[PDB]
Structure formats: structure tokens, C-alpha cells
Amino acid sequence: MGHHHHHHSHPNEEARLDILKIHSRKMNLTRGINLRKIAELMPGASGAEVKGVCTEAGMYALRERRVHVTQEDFEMAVAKVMQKDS
Numbered sequence: 737m738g739h740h741h742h743h744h745s746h747p748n749e750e751a752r753l754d755i756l757k758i759h760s761r762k763m764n765l766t767r768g769i770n771l772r773k774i775a776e777l778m779p780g781a782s783g784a785e786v787k788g789v790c791t792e793a794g795m796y797a798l799r800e801r802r803v804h805v806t807q808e809d810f811e812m813a814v815a816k817v818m819q820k821d822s
Contacts (some may be wrong), residue, residue: 738801745782747777755783756810759790763797764804774810781818 753775778786792813797805815821
């Protein structure tokens with residue numbers, strides 16, 4: 737019994753959401769940004785993918801010249817990182 741070689745880390749909902757709470761503290765967050773909805777969209781995925789989402793979100797902001805990032809940038813990033821939905 738047990739994964740004696742392939743050790744894949746998997747944090748809880750709050751645990752993984754904290755990763756976004758942390759890595760978002762450098763970019764201008766909007767007046768009512770919802771990160772809860774974002775973490776709920778990421779099943780299985782580890783913190784490495786979450787860091788990718790944080791980066792890709794800023795990319796989505798820059799193309800629309802957004803100085804303050806919204807939830808849209810993050811969820812669009814999630815869809816771009818996991819690449820499940822087409």
C-alpha cells in the first residue's frame with residue numbers, strides 16, 4: 737500500500753487558494769476580486785500550475801491594458817493552463 741515513488745502533492749481548497757491569496761499581493765487587485773471561484777475551477781492541479789495562473793492573469797490584463805486585475809483574467813488563465821475546455 738502507498739505511493740512509494742510518485743509523490744504528488746495535493747493541498748486542500750483553502751490551502752491551494754492561499755497560493756493565489758499570496759501570489760496576487762504584487763499586482764493591483766480590483767475593488768471586488770473573487771479568488772474563491774478561481775480555486776474551485778482547478779481540480780487536482782498543484783501549486784506550480786496555480787503560479788502559472790497568477791502569471792497568465794497579468795498577461796490577460798496587459799492585452800486589455802488593465803492596470804487593476806479582475807477575476808476574469810484569473811479564470812481565463814485557469815482555462816489556458818489546464819486546457820480542458822477546448
